[PDB]
Symmetry: D2
Subunit: 287 residues, 4 copies
């Protein structure tokens, strides 16, 4: 009977930007994949196709490049500039979501202007503005890790559908996908990112794992305990199964040496670790 326009947003996604800093012979590279989306009063655009309030996605894209010309210290600083621009520049635009993936490059033998991609991880940043408030979530993804031992899994309940054998020595491999929310915008973004990355890696490697859930809890705890500016961290860790191959059919034993790395299916353990007393469900997680 009665239809209503609910939450909505729009903009330009995946604007690939490469900013070269070359004021001197020592060139610097910043490589981003940027997405911009606006929120506000776009009722008529949807119900009547009246585009008076529709800042073209093409325009949003042009703005990303125009702002890049001035340079930016960090990815987060760049997103903050964009968000402020759109929200304050148009009265009907009350907020939005600006995100970016940051790709890393290393110099080729310390060369001044020749680099190679470091594809071992991807950094992410998301800024959400709502009225007079804003929140930032930083993250890391695509970071694959593995422990060849120091991982166990036993003591689980058994039912008629249970066939898994307990173990005190197995491989624990996963893809680190973590995202943390800052409780302030006054942060040394690059320093905290480097710190968090190291904390996650350290907790993963040094925690004698009795469960993937436990390892994840330790990784999250290390981050919250170390950085006051972080209120919560969310992680999604797949348990990439490395099956110990049965070689007895061929007359050989397998002392935890030969494994089959299966693609699918995979365990998927996810959790939110929070600072006691912090917000329970911030809107930025809705996406």
């Amino acid at each position: 009977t009665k239809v209503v326009l609910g939450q909505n947003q729009y903009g330009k996604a995946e604007v690939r930007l490469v900013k070269v800093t070359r004021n001197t012979a020592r060139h610097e590279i910043q490589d981003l994949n940027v997405t911009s989306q606006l929120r506000g009063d776009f009722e008529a655009a949807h119900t009547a196709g009246d585009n008076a309030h529709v800042v073209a996605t093409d325009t949003q894209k042009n703005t990303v490049y125009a702002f890049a010309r001035d340079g930016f210290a960090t990815t987060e600083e760049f997103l903050l500039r964009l968000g402020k621009h759109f929200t304050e520049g148009f009265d009907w635009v009350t907020g939005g979501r600006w995100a970016a993936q940051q790709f890393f490059w290393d110099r080729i033998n310390d060369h001044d202007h020749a680099f190679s991609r470091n594809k071992s991880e991807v950094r992410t940043a998301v800024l959400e503005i709502s009225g007079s408030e804003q929140a930032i979530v930083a993250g890391i993804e695509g970071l694959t890790v593995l422990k060849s031992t120091g991982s166990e899994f036993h003591g689980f309940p058994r039912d008629k559908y249970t066939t898994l054998q307990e173990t005190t020595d197995r491989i624990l491999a996963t893809d680190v996908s973590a995202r943390w929310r800052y409780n302030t915008v006054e942060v040394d973004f690059d320093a905290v990112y480097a710190s968090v990355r190291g904390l996650l890696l350290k907790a993963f490697a040094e925690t004698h794992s009795l469960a993937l859930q436990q390892t994840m809890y330790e990784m999250g705890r290390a981050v919250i305990e170390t950085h006051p500016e972080i209120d919560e961290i969310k992680m999604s860790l797949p348990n990439k199964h490395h099956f110990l191959v049965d070689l007895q059919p061929f007359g050989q034993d397998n002392p935890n040496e030969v494994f089959y790395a299966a693609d699918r299916p995979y365990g998927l353990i996810e959790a939110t670790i929070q600072r006691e007393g912090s917000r329970a469900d911030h809107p930025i997680w809705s996406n």
Copy 2:
């Protein structure tokens, strides 16, 4: 400050299942990619690695195959059986999230047991159980559509960074990604999915588009107006740009015939169309 375990869930993801129905010589094929995750009291598993409450992800996987043996009418009904099983079977398991992608197959020349994959779209279903509440969201993805005409875009504000020109004839191409939430589990799931797919395609094709936002609104309205069992539908539609190539430098015109289909960037228009008065932010959308 102290660290606290917040929202969390775990299970087996992407369990690929193929169920063949062969009671008669006329075989039937059901092809699914299933994910199972439980929610409940898993505090100890995280803080101490105590797995007493941890129904192994391997066990969850076995349960999917065991249940498939009995057959299932629809993907949603299969998920409902799984969800009820885990929630009712373990006191500490209070709910969960079960999802699946359904892949379509067509018979080869009406053959009794030879088929070919229809890859033009993928059907999805997500079930979330919270206590006695059962919420289901069905959807479609990977369905690419295009209108060669019947699309315009003008009347947008021209700010200092706007270079896009107004037009009364352009291509409108997108990938239909839609998800709708049922307000009841007593639905003819297959019939509604077919109807919804048809309504979306119809609105996309017959609406003279003045904006992607308008086309999306009409698609959503048609669904809600036609199906009382649906409370809301959310869509995420990219505007996959097909740029009219400028051939004038080569001494030729281009009467809306030759286009360059760009990969990135792309416009991304998203919105929720709701039945007036329905729930604003159902938890199932958080994932």
Copy 3:
């Protein structure tokens, strides 16, 4: 000590082109992914960086779009025009390789200008020119098929590394990738493509498979025996394993009904079926 420039080629790869035919209200869509590479005397370009003979890849790109404006009967006809243009338009260019992927679209409810992608298969074409000689290879890929029965596999040798049990009833699933070489350019390309596709599907479905190798042989035989303009057809067929899940542990049985579709590893069966007397190793297969 002494180095020599061997085989070489360069050009523009993956030029996405969409050609709309709209002389009438009944629009038509041709969607291609085109690649152009030239061969000839580019010695100086490599050893000295002398670009006198280097027709810019950007120029090759522009040519694709400029030629598309005139329209084309089939993809092969389009590649023929491009190859002729480059080899004859430049003295130092003696040949090249022009290829394309063709994507299929279906009308939405028979609409005049609204379509949806048929992603169930991708058509390919490759043209190679060498001096005054040219050859065309057409193909199909991405077409997934499956037989739920009518497939056996027994009688294979059993060495100390063999554990596979023989069977007279298993699922046979694969992705049809086939390419065939024409012995003449005067062909009804569209009609032959549709015919070949049908013959491959028919042979796959109606052949009681004793081995994937036999099924493939029968598929290729059908093609060669049906089309005089085809001298050989090459196929690469993966055996996408669907494992019968063991349900005995759950007190059940599995009468060829419940399967686990594994991603990797997979069997890979490949072969060339040719017309007796035809060329053994045509250069076009080198790429």
Copy 4:
């Protein structure tokens, strides 16, 4: 008329193996993606479905894991053992093709048994046996590199379809894909791979590029001149376009700082650099 079985091969593709060396607390990891295909007399398998000569692909897979138990010094040595086993172990198997991708891992803070994946490049190896002849090709792929300056492109011919402006300062970005053929099995495979990688990177970075063709030529020349065990090296280098954004409409200049990194299309330059007088078209390149 008369149909004949031509070249053919079959086996198991993409067997994911992880071999852990743990004789001491200092664990080592070897991660491979292995493919095994046999060649020989398989006539009856194709024409009659007689599997007497068909060593099951499952058996080939089992052999890979059983052989891994004994360990291997290098990927090439591992493939060599496999090839000899199958050709020598079965009279009707006269040759084959064994290949593998090798994935790299780095220790986490020098941990004894905790690692993270180095996804910046993938090492490859292919062995082909044809009767008494053996040939090995090693390679590297997925290595993305970029020069922010030190690249020019001018002096190219200009026809009616040329719009590209000459330049003396542009970005040169590509994905390094190279494969080289050894002329002997007496090679320190790991040492040569590390050396070739360094030579390719060094040549790419230090060569003032007047054309991608020239840069590639220098990369190849360096490898051949340095390693007597290599007879030829083939490269496929895309020119991943980074377009200098025009900000003049906004009254801003862009001194080679802000770029748009386009996905497709892309230039694709390929060449073979050979030791003078070596084999022109070795069969291994055909696949």
